[PDB]
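Newbie here. two chains, one complex. Structure please?
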Amino acid sequence: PVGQTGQLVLNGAQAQLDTALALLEQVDRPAPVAESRTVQRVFQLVNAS
Amino acid sequence: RTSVNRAIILLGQVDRAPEIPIVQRIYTVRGQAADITALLAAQYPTLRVT
């Protein structure tokens, strides 16, 4: 690893290299996002106060 | 059986491998310097990073 920078220097034979890159293409996707802990709604009342 | 032993000890002196002219350069790290020191110590492992 190049520190904690999300880069990764990996260094091996080309057979291993073109296999690991095909796997990593499959099982590696960005993490999901949290939704939120707070939401707002606005109601325009018509009859009540 | 004896001249051989004397030839070998002498032959080590007369026969030597060509030497490697170690060169020096100064690098100005951009980013952290602890991580790029560890990198250059797991990758090219005889570089004498000071």
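Moderator note: The helical segments of chain A are 14-24. The two ends of chain A are 62 Å apart (CA to CA). Thread marked as resolved.
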